[PDB]
Symmetry: C2
């Protein structure tokens, strides 16, 4: 309705800038494969529930079928690992948690299938093979950012060792915020993100912002001119791990 | 040299971003009307001084000539008012203050001419006509900014009258920063500026930044939820008139 409702009606639920955005109250169903979004029909939550009921039994029958085939080929119970982005359930797909609930209840009734958590399985399994996993990920210039990351990590390590035994709580606050800044600049989100309406823009702006904040602190530290008001500004805006200790960076490796 | 000197040489005198900027040390003279800037010859400060000596006598002779003509037509001493942007002397034109100094010394020797300040003239003049000046300036959409300015001024006046007699020093701090924000958004600089390498970009970004800060404070005030940490942030970054008093906005007009 933030795109549909009249501007005077909708003004103080969109952006203070006056730009149209999503409100969270939405009235249409997907309707069809049409590219003409104006032809979309109104949402009926009862039909939507009928869809989840069908889909949840589709998925159930697929997992039972897969289980039985695997038991017969394996001779032990398969553990079927199925990870999803959380926001896929309820956010991208409004009915997702409803689906999750129906699928759980169905699996609960199933004679072919059990829901397990991952810690239940490590606590229960007696035969498990030993193996070493290959380099991998679940995977999908611009190198001013990289040489800066390189120098920040290298510098962060130096200073954490250099001030390992310091008891100066100002230097410590500074080093602690440097690490936060460094970590904040490392967010994968800012790099090859899972940003919805993100666009490589707020993102590389994020990265550089944290790089710059880190270099500011580095400069004040290295030269005696710690600027306490700026540091407090940084502590406030970039407040992530209050309990952090820069000394994590001075530990051995290998 | 920030554009000419080799990158490894010049790195920590340009932008921390690595982008080439002006350093303030410059070796070429204008040389000619050529569009080919690479053909520029090296600066010789002695020839440059010879130029100021010539120019300063040109200008002197022009003002003496103008004075004599005016005295003869007027029957009283002319006051020749010549205003310039300060940065034109020494910044745009490196030799400008040298020119200013030579012109003063020449006027000092001149038998046709006297340097005056403006307060000397108002303190000295006996005949002065009475007149009313016409609307004028020394002059040279995008209206989201305007309706926001309109509402900010209107709101600022309301609240200054509403809290005229308040003794709450938090409300006062808030109202005082609102006025700063409002004034900061009014800078002509951000509107039809005298921005050198400014570009309508940092500028309208400036304006909107102050508009937004003002609206944030307005919202906290109007609803009981003054946010003291944000207010202190604003007091710190936008620190312009520490002694201001929002009550200036509650005075009568007309």
């Amino acid at each position: 309705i933030g795109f549909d409702r009249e501007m005077e009606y909708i003004k103080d639920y969109i952006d203070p800038s006056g730009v149209r955005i999503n409100t969270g109250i939405k009235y249409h169903r997907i309707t069809s494969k049409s590219l003409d979004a104006s032809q979309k029909e109104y949402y009926d939550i009862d039909l939507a529930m009928e869809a989840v009921e069908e889909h949840a039994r589709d998925f159930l029958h697929k997992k039972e079928s897969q289980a039985r085939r695997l038991m017969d080929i394996m001779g032990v119970e398969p553990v079927i690992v199925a990870p999803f982005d959380a926001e896929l359930f309820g956010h991208w797909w409004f009915e997702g948690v409803f689906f999750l609930k129906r699928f759980f209840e169905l699996v609960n009734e199933s004679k072919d299938l059990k829901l397990v958590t991952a810690s239940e399985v490590i606590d229960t399994l007696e035969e498990v093979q030993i193996a070493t996993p290959a380099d991998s990920s679940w995977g999908a210039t611009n190198d001013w950012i990289y040489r800066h990351l390189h120098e920040m990590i290298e510098r962060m390590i130096d200073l954490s060792k250099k001030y390992y035994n310091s008891s100066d709580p100002l230097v410590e606050r500074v080093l602690n915020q440097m690490l936060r800044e460094l970590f904040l600049a490392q967010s994968s989100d800012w790099a090859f993100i899972m940003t919805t309406r993100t666009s490589v823009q707020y993102a590389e702006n994020r990265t550089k912002l944290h790089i710059k904040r880190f270099l500011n602190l580095y400069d004040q530290l290295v030269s005696g001119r710690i600027d306490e008001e700026m540091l407090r500004y940084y502590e406030w805006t970039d407040a992530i791990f209050p309990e952090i200790n820069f000394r994590v960076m001075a530990r051995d490796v290998i």
